[PDB]
Design a protein around this ligand. Sequence first.
Ligand SMILES: *[C@@H]1O[C@H](CO)[C@@H](O)[C@H](O)[C@H]1NC(C)=O
Lengths: 50, 50
Amino acid sequence: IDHKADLAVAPLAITYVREKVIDFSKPFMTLGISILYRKPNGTNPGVFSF
Amino acid sequence: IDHKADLAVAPLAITYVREKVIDFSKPFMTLGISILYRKPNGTNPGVFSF
Ligand SMILES: *[C@@H]1O[C@H](CO)[C@@H](O)[C@H](O)[C@H]1NC(C)=O
C-alpha cells in the first residue's frame, strides 16, 4: 500500500481483504485444504493367524 | 470489444490470447482435463475364476 517495492513473488493467498487494497495478477498455481492420514501400514500378519 | 454488451457470465477460458484484447475477473471455479471411463462391470472369465 506504501511504496518500498511493487512485487512480491511468494505464496500470498488472493482474498477479498487482500484484494480491496492490493492488486493481484493471475494465479500461477492452485491450492486447497485437504486431509492427511496415516496410510494402511500393512497386513501386520501373525503366521499363527490360522 | 465493440462495447455493444457488458458482463457476460458463461464458460470462457482465461487463455493468453483472449486476455490480450479483453479484461477478465478472478475465476469463480477451476477445472482441467480428466479421464472419462466406464464403470467396471465384472463379467468374469472362466478357467481363472474358480
Ligand atoms: C457390462 O455390461 C455392459 C452392458 O452390456 C457392457 O457394455 C459392458 O461391456 C460390460 N462390461 C464392461 C466392460 O463394463
